[PDB]
Amino acid sequence: AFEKTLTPIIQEYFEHGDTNEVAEMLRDLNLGEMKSGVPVLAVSLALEGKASHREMTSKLLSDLCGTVMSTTDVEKSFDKLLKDLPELALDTPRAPQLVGQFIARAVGDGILCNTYIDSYKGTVDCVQARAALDKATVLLSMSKKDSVWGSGGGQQSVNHLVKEIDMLLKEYLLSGDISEAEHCLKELEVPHFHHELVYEAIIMVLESTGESTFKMILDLLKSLWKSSTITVDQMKRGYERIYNEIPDINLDVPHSYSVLERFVEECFQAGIISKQLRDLCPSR
């Protein structure tokens, strides 16, 4: 019933994001011995969710540490965490690697003192604990940035998300790597904003010279379509946005109405939008 007490508190935090509400709740509970319990739970839960949660958890720990518990408490928790890796790694295959990133972040944030890792020197006969530690080590050396986790999540600003979605697309045009793009799209964790993806990828073709961008963006969308990575709805609202904004796009791109139409046709042709949607495309 201490996991029953604490799990809701932490899961809710995951929804709202406000570590103060978590702090208070804990103060109002008076744990003492079991303070070091909390960071064990939280990390466990975060290991079974997405990066965004893992980010939120590092942050919760930074804040909780000072104000509701000590680095002494923190250090115990990670000791526990590494004790557990073998079991954790059964529900979270990359658990060693991931705990290594929490560790690395927790040094970084001084909730783990600067000799935590070397305190493990010539000790482990646990292969997975040592892998956790190596990762943290390596990570820590080469950060002599901003986040080991991503920066996706519905907790980010449309601005930030726009910058990523842009990154992502600019990147694909040089990579050619559809899979790398699917991945980046997933890490944003923002499936009701996928219409931006579609939107910005079409605008890229509109403003582009030659046949390349054309071909590449059409390949991208076809693949995303074929796997359902992007939903029909989200593809729809994507086009509908261009449809509606093609006057203004046309300011910067005189030929815009021309490619738009040529492009939209090749979509219908490759099976990825309906007739309804293809027929609703502005003519000149």
Partner 1 sequence: SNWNEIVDSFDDMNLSESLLRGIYAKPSAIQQRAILPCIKGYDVIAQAQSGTGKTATFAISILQQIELDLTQALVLAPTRELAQQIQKVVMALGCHACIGGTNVRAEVQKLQMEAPHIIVGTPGRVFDMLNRRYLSPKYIKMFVLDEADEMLSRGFKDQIYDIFQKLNSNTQVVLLSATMPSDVLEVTKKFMRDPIRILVKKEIRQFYINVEREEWKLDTLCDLYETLTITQAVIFINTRRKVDWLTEKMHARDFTVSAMHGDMDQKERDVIMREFRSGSSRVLITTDLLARGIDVQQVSLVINYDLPTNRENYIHRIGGRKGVAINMVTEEDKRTLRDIETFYNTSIEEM
Contacts with partner 1, residue ranges (CB under 8 A): 8, 11-12, 15-18, 21, 24-25, 48-49, 87, 89-94, 138-139, 141-142, 145-146, 151, 153-155, 157-158, 167, 170-171, 174-177, 180, 182-184, 186, 189-193, 195, 207, 212, 227-229, 231, 233-234, 237, 241, 245, 248-255
Choice between 48 and 72, CB closer to partner 1:
48
Choice between 180 and 279, CB closer to partner 1:
180
Choice between 186 and 278, CB closer to partner 1:
186
Shortest spacing between CB 134 and partner 1, in angstroms: 8
Shortest spacing between CB 184 and partner 1, in angstroms: 8
Short-list 96, 159, 98, CA closest to 129: 96
Choice between 14 and 116, CB closer to partner 1:
14
Shortest spacing between CB 27 and partner 1, in angstroms: 12
Choice between 245 and 265, CB closer to partner 1:
245
Shortest spacing between CB 71 and partner 1, in angstroms: 26
